[PDB]
Amino acid sequence: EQPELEARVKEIIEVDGYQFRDLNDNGELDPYEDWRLPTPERVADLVGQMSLVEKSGLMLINTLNAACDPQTGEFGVLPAQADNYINTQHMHRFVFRNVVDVRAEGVECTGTGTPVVSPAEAATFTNAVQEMSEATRLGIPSLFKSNARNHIDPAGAFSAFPKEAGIAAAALGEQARRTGEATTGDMSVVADFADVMGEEWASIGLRGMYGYMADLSTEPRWYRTHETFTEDAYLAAEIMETLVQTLQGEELTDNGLALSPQTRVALTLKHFPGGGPQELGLDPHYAFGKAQVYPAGRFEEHFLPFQAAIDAGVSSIMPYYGVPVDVPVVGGEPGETYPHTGFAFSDSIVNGLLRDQLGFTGYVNSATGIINDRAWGLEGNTVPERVAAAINGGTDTLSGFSDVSVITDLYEADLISEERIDLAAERLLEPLFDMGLFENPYVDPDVATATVGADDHRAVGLDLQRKSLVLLQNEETDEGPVLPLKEGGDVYILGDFTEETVESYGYEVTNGNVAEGEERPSAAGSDYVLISMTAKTNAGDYVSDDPSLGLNPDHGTNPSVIIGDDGEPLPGLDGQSLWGAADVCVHKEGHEENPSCTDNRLRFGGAYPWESSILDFTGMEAAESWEVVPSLETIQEVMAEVEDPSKVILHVYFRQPYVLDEESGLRDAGAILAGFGMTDTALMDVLTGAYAPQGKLPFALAGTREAIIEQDSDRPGYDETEDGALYPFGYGLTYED
């Protein structure tokens, strides 16, 4: 019965033969400290003793990163804003963004930037925050959330896995290697990944997540396909179910939430109802990309993975910035559409669709910056007006908003009722109770050291890397198929290959990667050419109100149209405006003097908006804000110096569903693999035949720019286009014989 209790400032108290934490420092036992009672009654007693500001502080979540002071050699101290957030704003939810790794010798604390911290230092930092939390009047604990950390970027000491779509490829491939079928995948691969991440996250006291993403990659021009699992809703549904079961547990409360003291990481699933179907792929972080469109009528299909995650008891939901355009209200009086505002502001979306229609009984966490920067559809409204609209729309905690004053001022003005703040407070405290943090909110920094990156954990990651690789093309030469490689030979490498690691498999290696200014050795005479290639955006120069860029008529107009609920188009989104005209710096709607641009530097990712359809390697080589790595020109030189292109092996990182266009000559390679992040050891283990590739594509690939521009943003595949798919969902070759 008795759970372990740790208390670093408040006192433990003996009652009825059991021990309890005395968090309000009166000395005797309140029902909220009494872990023998059901959680609703602990909540009831806690919210009853709370001041208004104390309850409003729960409705904020903000970045709280570890810092370093250059003078004791301590990394993992509290940042500048730690006292203000906790003691003035009364916050208990935080976003932890530091890279966790072992720092190189010679590294002191620099200036700004988010410092790298070790597992033990990270757990020390979060413990120190928990200590300051327990030091609050009622000793309510804190919750840390974080974005993903366990994936290779083609993190730190966390065990490295392929990206999300790599994990789906491995799941589908493994189902295929047993059943001969690739539908919803073998979820043991997903569970095996989530078991490692859960243990490592929990070990540093990181008990909550911004994610995972249930978004569907049905629009290939969306830069965020780099972190989607698949374009298929049914496979997404299966992956979210498995993630929640494994990371949150299978023990559901009577409120229907998978929350126990054995919950390792509570998920804040994103981005509800589905961030996938972005018009022209433009992302609603930016003002030109507010709109989500549903030409194929698949609004219901996109929230299907959220249904599955809600039914498995996911703890939290983050709505996206997007504005649904002309979307029929689900379970609604006919002819009714959802508001043309961001999802977090529409009561019909958050309370109506999410809670009433889909049955979600947890709390809602806004995407970051919706109040100041991305209150889409509320451009003329003020900050307090936007805050009231989101809370009253059904959002319980605001990310990136740290001014609790605004919430209290709205209550004293009867713009938010005390019933609403009480209802938010109940929902935000419920998971902290069930997760057992009122009993023990601390972690052992030395066990983090023994957990983060454990040998067996990295092995599961290595296995998943090798199983995620997808063989798309393996030509049959007169000597047999190109892959697996034969033992020995002269190998030319181009791209992100580490020469000595390729030499290590018994090959003589010529390195085509030379600094600019040197000669590149010719690939003539090579038995094998290995090219590891990808494309990246390069849009950091974008400026919304610059007449050279965002306001350049030679860059065209923004076709996106969003009619306000007032009947007049949103600024810059009438279907005829310059690309930059939707940014607040240009339209200046709203209560502020000369507002900064929200879109400058496209700093979250994505291409120049007028280049978002250029996913073909030939197009991307010529584009302003795309780059092919290594350059396609160099790849084409290389493929020609060897003459027989059947000796070229292309490993492609499809960060987005890039298009192998016939004009580029890439299809002429003897082998083509799709990789989703892996060590060179794992790629070489498969190339040389120690393991056979078995991954299957979790999204379709097109062969023409025309197919990209023609496909429905909300529809998977390319079967409705004239040119169709180059490779379908579920496709993947293996070694035979």
Residues near ligand B9I, by CB under 6 A: 95, 147, 210, 270, 367-369, 373, 399-400
Query: Minimum CB separation from Zn ion for residue 680, in Å?
Result: 17
Per-residue DSSP letter, 349: I
As a whole number of angstroms, the distance between CA 438 and CA 524 comes to 68
If one counts every other C-beta atom within 10 angstroms of the C-beta of residue 643, the result is: 11
Query: Could you say which of Zn ion, ligand B9I, none residue 368 binds, taking C-beta under 5 to 8 angstroms by partner kind?
Result: ligand B9I
| Binding characters for Zn ion, 61-100, by CB under 5 A (x = yes) | -----------------------------x----------
Q: Is residue 409 involved in binding Zn ion (CB under 5 A)? A: no
Which one of the spans 10-18, 178-186, 428-436, 487-495 is the region binding Zn ion (CB under 5 A)?
Answer: 10-18
> Closest CB to ligand B9I among 353 and 367?
367
CA angle, residues 643, 646, 648, in degrees to nearest 5: 85
Q: Is residue 520 involved in binding Zn ion (CB under 5 A)? A: no
C-alpha distances in Å from residue 47, one per residue of 398, 428, 657, 726 = 19, 11, 49, 58
Query: Minimum CB separation from ligand B9I for residue 127, in Å?
Result: 23
Q: Is residue 130 involved in binding Zn ion (CB under 5 A)? A: no
CA angle, residues 88, 89, 93, in degrees to nearest 5: 130
Interacting residues with Zn ion between 692 and 711 (CB under 5 A): 711
Query: Minimum CB separation from ligand B9I for residue 462, in Å?
Result: 27
Residue linked to tokens 């791209």: 495
Under a CB-based contact definition with an 8 Å cutoff, are residues 238 and 181 in contact? no
Query: Could you say which of Zn ion, ligand B9I, none residue 373 binds, taking C-beta under 5 to 8 angstroms by partner kind?
Result: ligand B9I
> Closest CB to ligand B9I among 604 and 644?
604
Query: Minimum CB separation from Zn ion for residue 725, in Å?
Result: 11
Q: Is residue 446 involved in binding Zn ion (CB under 5 A)? A: yes
Per-residue DSSP letter, 350: I
Query: Minimum CB separation from Zn ion for residue 619, in Å?
Result: 14
Query: Minimum CB separation from ligand B9I for residue 727, in Å?
Result: 28
> Closest CB to ligand B9I among 354 and 370?
370
Choose which of 311, 403, 409, 475 interacts with Zn ion (CB under 5 A). Answer: 403
Q: Does 324 sit behind a cis peptide bond, omega within 30 degrees of 0 on the bond before it?
A: no
Q: Is residue 30 involved in binding Zn ion (CB under 5 A)? A: yes
> Closest CB to ligand B9I among 270 and 696?
270
Query: Could you say which of Zn ion, ligand B9I, none residue 302 binds, taking C-beta under 5 to 8 angstroms by partner kind?
Result: none
Choose which of 36, 588, 591, 603 interacts with Zn ion (CB under 5 A). Answer: 591
Question: What would the 3-class secondary structure string for 274-287 be?
Answer: CCCCEHHHCCCCCH
Choose which of 218, 346, 532, 537 interacts with Zn ion (CB under 5 A). Answer: 218
Under a CB-based contact definition with an 8 Å cutoff, are residues 171 and 190 in contact? yes
Using CB positions, name the residue nearest to Zn ion.
405
Residue 447 structure tokens: 């066990």
As a whole number of angstroms, the distance between CA 150 and CA 194 comes to 10
Please name every residue paired with 508 in a beta bridge, in sequence order, or none if there are none.
Answer: 490
Query: Minimum CB separation from Zn ion for residue 555, in Å?
Result: 6
Q: What's the one-letter identity of residue 599? A: D
Q: Is residue 554 involved in binding Zn ion (CB under 5 A)? A: yes
Query: Minimum CB separation from ligand B9I for residue 93, in Å?
Result: 12
Residue linked to tokens 């390697």: 617
As a whole number of angstroms, the distance between CA 705 and CA 394 comes to 41
Query: Could you say which of ligand B9I, Zn ion, none residue 364 binds, taking C-beta under 5 to 8 angstroms by partner kind?
Result: none
109 half-sphere exposure, CB direction, 13 A CA radius: 16
> Closest CB to ligand B9I among 19 and 147?
147
Per-residue DSSP letter, 320: -
Query: Could you say which of ligand B9I, Zn ion, none residue 400 binds, taking C-beta under 5 to 8 angstroms by partner kind?
Result: ligand B9I
Q: Which residues contact 518 (CB under 8 A, 6 or more apart)?
A: none
Q: Is residue 518 involved in binding Zn ion (CB under 5 A)? A: no
Query: Could you say which of ligand B9I, Zn ion, none residue 336 binds, taking C-beta under 5 to 8 angstroms by partner kind?
Result: none
For the chain, the 3-state helix, strand and coil shares in percent, each to the nearest 5, are 35, 15, 50
Helix, strand, or coil (residue 327): coil
Q: Is residue 24 involved in binding Zn ion (CB under 5 A)? A: yes
Query: Minimum CB separation from Zn ion for residue 532, in Å?
Result: 15
As a whole number of angstroms, the distance between CA 7 and CA 433 comes to 16
Sheet of 363-364: strands edge to edge? 208-213, 266-272, 316-319, 363-364
Query: Minimum CB separation from ligand B9I for residue 289, in Å?
Result: 12
Q: Which residues contact 344 (CB under 8 A, 6 or more apart)?
A: 319, 321, 350, 364, 366, 367, 370, 390, 393, 395
Which one of the spans 52-60, 101-109, 246-254, 666-674 is the region binding Zn ion (CB under 5 A)?
Answer: 52-60
> Closest CB to Zn ion among 558 and 711?
711
Under a CB-based contact definition with an 8 Å cutoff, are residues 321 and 296 in contact? no
> Closest CB to ligand B9I among 374 and 715?
374
Q: Is residue 8 involved in binding Zn ion (CB under 5 A)? A: no
Residue 717 structure tokens: 């595949």
Q: Is residue 55 involved in binding Zn ion (CB under 5 A)? A: no
Choose which of 7, 21, 32, 54 interacts with Zn ion (CB under 5 A). Answer: 54
> Closest CB to ligand B9I among 368 and 664?
368
Using CB positions, name the residue nearest to ligand B9I.
400
Q: Is residue 34 involved in binding Zn ion (CB under 5 A)? A: no
DSSP letter for each residue of 165-190: HHHHHHHHHHHHHHHS--SS--HHHH
Q: Is residue 724 involved in binding Zn ion (CB under 5 A)? A: no
As a whole number of angstroms, the distance between CA 362 and CA 349 comes to 15
Choose which of 109, 155, 454, 629 interacts with Zn ion (CB under 5 A). Answer: 454
Under a CB-based contact definition with an 8 Å cutoff, are residues 617 and 701 in contact? no
CA angle, residues 397, 401, 403, in degrees to nearest 5: 105
As a whole number of angstroms, the distance between CA 611 and CA 609 comes to 5
Query: Could you say which of ligand B9I, Zn ion, none residue 446 binds, taking C-beta under 5 to 8 angstroms by partner kind?
Result: Zn ion
> Closest CB to ligand B9I among 583 and 712?
583
Q: Does 3 sit behind a cis peptide bond, omega within 30 degrees of 0 on the bond before it?
A: no
Per-residue DSSP letter, 357: I
Binding residues for Zn ion (CB under 5 A): 16, 22, 24, 26, 30, 54, 90, 136, 140, 218, 226, 278-279, 282, 284, 289, 291, 403, 405, 444, 446, 454, 480, 508, 554, 564, 591, 655, 711-712, 715
